[PDB]
Design a protein around this ligand. Sequence first.
Ligand SMILES: NC[C@@H]1O[C@H](O[C@H]2[C@@H](O)[C@H](O[C@@H]3[C@@H](O)[C@H](N)C[C@H](N)[C@H]3O[C@H]3O[C@H](CO)[C@@H](O)[C@H](O)[C@H]3N)O[C@@H]2CO)[C@H](N)[C@@H](O)[C@@H]1O
Ligand SMILES: NC[C@@H]1O[C@H](O[C@H]2[C@@H](O)[C@H](O[C@@H]3[C@@H](O)[C@H](N)C[C@H](N)[C@H]3O[C@H]3O[C@H](CO)[C@@H](O)[C@H](O)[C@H]3N)O[C@@H]2CO)[C@H](N)[C@@H](O)[C@@H]1O
Ligand SMILES: [K+]
Ligand SMILES: [K+]
Ligand SMILES: [Mg+2]
Ligand SMILES: [Mg+2]
Ligand SMILES: [Mg+2]
Ligand SMILES: [Mg+2]
Ligand SMILES: [Mg+2]
Ligand SMILES: [Mg+2]
Ligand SMILES: [Mg+2]
Ligand SMILES: [Mg+2]
Ligand SMILES: [Mg+2]
Ligand SMILES: [Mg+2]
Ligand SMILES: [Mg+2]
Ligand SMILES: [Mg+2]
Ligand SMILES: [Mg+2]
Ligand SMILES: [Mg+2]
Ligand SMILES: [Mg+2]
Ligand SMILES: [Mg+2]
Ligand SMILES: [Mg+2]
Ligand SMILES: [Mg+2]
Ligand SMILES: [Mg+2]
Ligand SMILES: [Mg+2]
Ligand SMILES: [Mg+2]
Ligand SMILES: [Mg+2]
Ligand SMILES: [Mg+2]
Ligand SMILES: [Mg+2]
Ligand SMILES: [Mg+2]
Ligand SMILES: [Mg+2]
Ligand SMILES: [Mg+2]
Ligand SMILES: [Mg+2]
Ligand SMILES: [Mg+2]
Ligand SMILES: [Mg+2]
Ligand SMILES: [Mg+2]
Ligand SMILES: [Mg+2]
Lengths: 101, 119, 88, 73
Amino acid sequence: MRRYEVNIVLNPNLDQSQLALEKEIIQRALENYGARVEKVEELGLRRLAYPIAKDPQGYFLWYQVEMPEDRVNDLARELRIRDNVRRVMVVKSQEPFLANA
Amino acid sequence: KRQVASGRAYIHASYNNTIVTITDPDGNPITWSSGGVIGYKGSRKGTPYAAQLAALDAAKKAMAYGMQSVDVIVRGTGAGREQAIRALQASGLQVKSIVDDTPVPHNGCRPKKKFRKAS
Amino acid sequence: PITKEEKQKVIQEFARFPGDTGSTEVQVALLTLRINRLSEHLKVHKKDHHSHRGLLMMVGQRRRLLRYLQREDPERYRALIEKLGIRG
Amino acid sequence: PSRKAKVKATLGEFDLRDYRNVEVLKRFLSETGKILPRRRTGLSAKEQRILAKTIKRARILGLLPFTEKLVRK
RNA sequence: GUGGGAGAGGGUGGUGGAAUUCCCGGAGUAGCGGUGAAAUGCGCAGAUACCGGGAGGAACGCCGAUGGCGAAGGCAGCCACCUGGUCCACCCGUGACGCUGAGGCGCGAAAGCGUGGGGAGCAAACCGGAUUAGAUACCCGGGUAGUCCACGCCCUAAACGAUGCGCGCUAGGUCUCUGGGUCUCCUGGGGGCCGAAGCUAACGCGUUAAGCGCGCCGCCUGGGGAGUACGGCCGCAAGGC
Ligand SMILES: NC[C@@H]1O[C@H](O[C@H]2[C@@H](O)[C@H](O[C@@H]3[C@@H](O)[C@H](N)C[C@H](N)[C@H]3O[C@H]3O[C@H](CO)[C@@H](O)[C@H](O)[C@H]3N)O[C@@H]2CO)[C@H](N)[C@@H](O)[C@@H]1O
Ligand SMILES: NC[C@@H]1O[C@H](O[C@H]2[C@@H](O)[C@H](O[C@@H]3[C@@H](O)[C@H](N)C[C@H](N)[C@H]3O[C@H]3O[C@H](CO)[C@@H](O)[C@H](O)[C@H]3N)O[C@@H]2CO)[C@H](N)[C@@H](O)[C@@H]1O
Ligand SMILES: [K+]
Ligand SMILES: [K+]
Ligand SMILES: [Mg+2]
Ligand SMILES: [Mg+2]
Ligand SMILES: [Mg+2]
Ligand SMILES: [Mg+2]
Ligand SMILES: [Mg+2]
Ligand SMILES: [Mg+2]
Ligand SMILES: [Mg+2]
Ligand SMILES: [Mg+2]
Ligand SMILES: [Mg+2]
Ligand SMILES: [Mg+2]
Ligand SMILES: [Mg+2]
Ligand SMILES: [Mg+2]
Ligand SMILES: [Mg+2]
Ligand SMILES: [Mg+2]
Ligand SMILES: [Mg+2]
Ligand SMILES: [Mg+2]
Ligand SMILES: [Mg+2]
Ligand SMILES: [Mg+2]
Ligand SMILES: [Mg+2]
Ligand SMILES: [Mg+2]
Ligand SMILES: [Mg+2]
Ligand SMILES: [Mg+2]
Ligand SMILES: [Mg+2]
Ligand SMILES: [Mg+2]
Ligand SMILES: [Mg+2]
Ligand SMILES: [Mg+2]
Ligand SMILES: [Mg+2]
Ligand SMILES: [Mg+2]
Ligand SMILES: [Mg+2]
Ligand SMILES: [Mg+2]
Ligand SMILES: [Mg+2]
Ligand SMILES: [Mg+2]
């Protein structure tokens, strides 16, 4: 059991129904792969520095989880299955490194 | 015939020649000109003077489309890049902005031996 | 990899007396742990040579320690080998 | 080279390891999308090394750019 | 052993953007390209320049360093997994368990070979243009093997610090990477520069010795003949020892 951060960028054009659906599927995958959700930050629609799948914006989701290591990669693959999912980046969590502290 | 009146101006400048394409704001070409479009044939196309004449010719043919103001985009290092810029500024087209879009790979493709000692 | 509880479990297993960390038995046991794990890694990943050098070094170290044990107390040597299931 | 001002010296306290923080990370990039050299950023070796990975992560997340156009040439 | 650290060390899967080429569409027209100057070449079956979309291969800009890691060859986008080495602090455990190392075994850049994939860019050979007294070349236009992946061979090199490995001893100064501490400074591990003593034919080396010493290994004995002949071992071959 190691601590990770799942970043997920979604389609900005999603309405309530489709978005809530995508979140439910995401959390169902997080459940199915044994990942326990600690803290969640939903940032939402934000500007991008470059277009992603033709869209100038993206819908940002951030999860902090504790899951088994061996399954991690696999989980990410699953998250990429969805058509409406733009980006998935799973980062092994780390302690902050301050400058000017 | 269009009647555009505002557009883009692309100066593609290499060591061997300078070609200038005036387009509508959607990017589609209206007119173009080069060192060889004017009388010049051999190495003389790479001349700054050739760039001046080319820029002016492109701008003229553009003002025939009723073009007034353009945005300049520059690609590539070579003489007559800045001469093309200056000629466009003196052209009778108001120049709004100038931008360097020159393409560079992030270590992408192997160069010809002439361009080597790099990648 | 090798976590803390695994390592402690094997240390307290081969410890001569309570508080024994670096005695030859414990050292050979630890080395054997790492070696079996690394050999398992090299069952796959046959193209990892650099790790394999590590394996070589560990095996050498273990063989040297065991040689010392054989030299000193043959019974403790026999017991250790029987326990870990080495050589052969 | 690096003749104006001190990127780290004027700035607050911040986590160098945070990829999601755009407003602070923008300051470490030039007119183009390029990561500024130490002589500009004013950071140290370790700091810089961390900054690079943070920025690259952010770029992949679509938060920061890779390259950019130069203006007023 | 416990605790803490830095790292392009290695293997597998995934994934990102830039650029090149090609394909489709749009707009547009007389050239583009290339050189010392040109020509071959490409373009009215619409090229070059510009925009939109798509496909594929390979390499990772900035960071990047006078930097880091590795025994060497060598290692650079990002993410996860697997995994090797190493440094520091505590002074906790074992109690000489050490060093070197003929043979053996393994690793070993590039090119090269085998089977099967792949093939954007580059390109031995080759086909052309030019240059020249000639031009089998340098320059330009094309271009196959190859460069890429998997598995299996080959075993070489200016494989270089042209400096075997280990330990102890012999002024300092200065820059740097990475730890710890009473944190202007002290202390440890790396990487550079100037230099005590000393050494060196000289050049230079000088706590990262080429100084003072001890241990073990490999090697040299004028030049050409010649890394050739003969023999043996290795290799599918090229060829190597
Ligand atoms: N990203 C996976 C990497 O794969 C490497 O090896 C793999 C890659 O070289 C390559 O993966 C795919 C390939 O399946 C497919 N046929 C074509 C694709 N372009 C390749 O990918 C790679 O190709 C080359 C590799 O030199 C790179 O230039 C390119 O950037 C990269 N995308 O083929 C190999 C087998 O899948 C190494 N295992 C390691 O670096 C890493 O795991
Ligand atoms: N080495 C690979 C890289 O390791 C980095 O992190 C590595 C280092 O930070 C860390 O070093 C630790 C050290 O902190 C700690 N104090 C002691 C430990 N023995 C070291 O680990 C070391 O030894 C073990 C075997 O015991 C190996 O498995 C491991 O690869 C090696 N680094 O071990 C990590 C794994 O090797 C990068 N974060 C990771 O992304 C990347 O894979
Ligand atoms: K000299
Ligand atoms: K034979
Ligand atoms: Mg020309
Ligand atoms: Mg490179
Ligand atoms: Mg290189
Ligand atoms: Mg690495
Ligand atoms: Mg077309
Ligand atoms: Mg016609
Ligand atoms: Mg055609
Ligand atoms: Mg193709
Ligand atoms: Mg550089
Ligand atoms: Mg080297
Ligand atoms: Mg003690
Ligand atoms: Mg005692
Ligand atoms: Mg040997
Ligand atoms: Mg080889
Ligand atoms: Mg090769
Ligand atoms: Mg082959
Ligand atoms: Mg070619
Ligand atoms: Mg050629
Ligand atoms: Mg062949
Ligand atoms: Mg063939
Ligand atoms: Mg091979
Ligand atoms: Mg050298
Ligand atoms: Mg050296
Ligand atoms: Mg040296
Ligand atoms: Mg030092
Ligand atoms: Mg030092
Ligand atoms: Mg002297
Ligand atoms: Mg000196
Ligand atoms: Mg010899
Ligand atoms: Mg002789
Ligand atoms: Mg003689
Ligand atoms: Mg020979």
